[PDB]
């Protein structure tokens, strides 16, 4: 240990294209094991939702 230091910050929101999937005709979100996710868009009106596993 010496007097030099570097700061660590919180992580950013990481996008994942593979997470979303298709049903017969629909959009499906299946978060990985023990993971919470946020789903967003304006396809009609705005929708910001949070899914907890």
């Amino acid at each position, epitope marked *: 240990n010496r007097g030099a230091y570097v700061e660590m910050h919180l992580p950013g929101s990481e996008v994942d294209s593979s997470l979303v999937s298709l049903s017969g005709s629909s959009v499906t979100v299946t978060p990985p094991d023990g993971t919470s996710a946020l789903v967003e868009c*304006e*396809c*009609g*009106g*705005t929708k910001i939702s949070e899914t907890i596993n």
Partner: nanobody
Amino acid sequence: DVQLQASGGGSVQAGGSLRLSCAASGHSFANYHVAWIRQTPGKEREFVGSASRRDDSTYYADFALGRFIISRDNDINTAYLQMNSLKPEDSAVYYCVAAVMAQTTQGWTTDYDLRGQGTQVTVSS
């Protein structure tokens, strides 16, 4: 001034059909999301449906699905709301709202980039 005029309402028996029109004077609908907002007396303005030219998408509320249709003819800068199967709960005044994206369509829009005069529809049981 860019003004929107709504028309096509009136008194019609339940189970019929009607066609409302929103026309813009001063600017076209070429880059405007068109949203229909309904105001029944005694309550708050309620969302009906929205249409988008950029992605050709249409949003309909729970009561509006399977009954209401929205179309746009940019040639005469007008937006049409063709709806059928009247019910007594549909008596209200309708306004048309035009917005340049800006993420204004979140649930309750409550933005009104362009506000226009509405028209009253009465439903007789």
